[PDB]
Amino acid sequence: MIINHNLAAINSHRVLKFQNEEVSKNMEKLSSGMRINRAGDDASGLAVSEKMRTQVN
Amino acid sequence: LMNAYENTQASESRIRDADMAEETVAFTKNQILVQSGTAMLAQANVRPQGVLSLL
């Protein structure tokens, strides 16, 4: 066994950090109640949404 | 005069007086959303507790 570096720990940590990032992404939109909150999730969708917001106002 | 008064009052009421149905619909929507928001805040508050499992 090689004990200087633990590769399974590194793999599990990477998977954990990306799962946590996705959890935070889900949680922020669950709190806000909107599908898109900041740009990059759906740029065209956000632009169309702003257009219809101006239209309804 | 008693016709001009009622017309002006109708106009002013349209300008300034609210509508109860729309206001209460918005109130119910915002109440539901704030309940969901506080539930999710409570859920997220306990989220970082899992790190102690590997300590």
Side-chain angles (χ1 to χ4, degrees):
Chain A
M1 193 144 201
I2 298 309
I3 49 100
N4 307 60
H5 293 283
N6 196 211
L7 266 305
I10 299 161
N11 187 6
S12 298
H13 160 52
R14 180 175 57 77
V15 175
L16 218 31
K17 86 172 286 142
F18 289 139
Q19 265 316 307
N20 267 358
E21 184 170 310
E22 191 170 11
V23 155
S24 301
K25 283 225 293 292
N26 277 258
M27 191 135 43
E28 69 151 77
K29 108 171 53 183
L30 245 194
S31 302
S32 180
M34 264 151 28
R35 218 175 63 75
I36 49 260
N37 324 297
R38 184 61 181 211
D41 230 354
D42 190 3
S44 153
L46 181 132
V48 171
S49 78
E50 299 293 337
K51 153 196 164 192
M52 321 205 88
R53 276 219 223 278
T54 56
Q55 285 313 298
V56 297
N57 296 7
Chain B
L1 279 149
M2 61 196 209
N3 194 356
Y5 148 76
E6 71 141 324
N7 285 301
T8 323
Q9 185 56 268
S11 63
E12 188 266 346
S13 68
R14 222 179 318 241
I15 292 313
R16 187 155 178 168
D17 287 317
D19 196 0
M20 292 304 92
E22 284 65 24
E23 290 287 338
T24 202
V25 160
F27 181 86
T28 62
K29 164 242 276 186
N30 300 314
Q31 189 46 250
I32 293 196
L33 278 173
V34 70
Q35 290 203 233
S36 57
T38 182
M40 290 296 329
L41 168 57
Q43 193 144 30
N45 229 308
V46 84
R47 161 149 157 270
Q49 105 284 54
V51 186
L52 294 316
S53 73
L54 60 99
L55 258 297

